[PDB]
Amino acid sequence: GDTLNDVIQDPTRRNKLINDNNLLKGIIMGRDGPVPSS
């Protein structure tokens, strides 16, 4: 029964969570809609 605490305490899992969710990247509010920035 792991939670976000177990993910955040592990650098590999924490960085996987950060990367797979684009948490370091902003959002482009284009006229066609919001898209994550690369």
Residues in touch with other proteins (CB under 8 A): 1-2, 4, 6-7, 13, 16-17, 20-21, 23, 25-31, 34, 36-37
Least distance CB 5 / other proteins (angstroms): 11
Is the Cβ–Cβ distance between 25 and 37 less than 8 Å? yes
Name every residue whose Cβ is closer than 8 Å to that of residue 23 and which is 6 or more positions away in sequence: 17
Least distance CB 37 / other proteins (angstroms): 4
Of residues 11 and 29, the one with the C-beta less far from other proteins: 29
Residues 3, 23: Cα–Cα separation, whole Å: 18
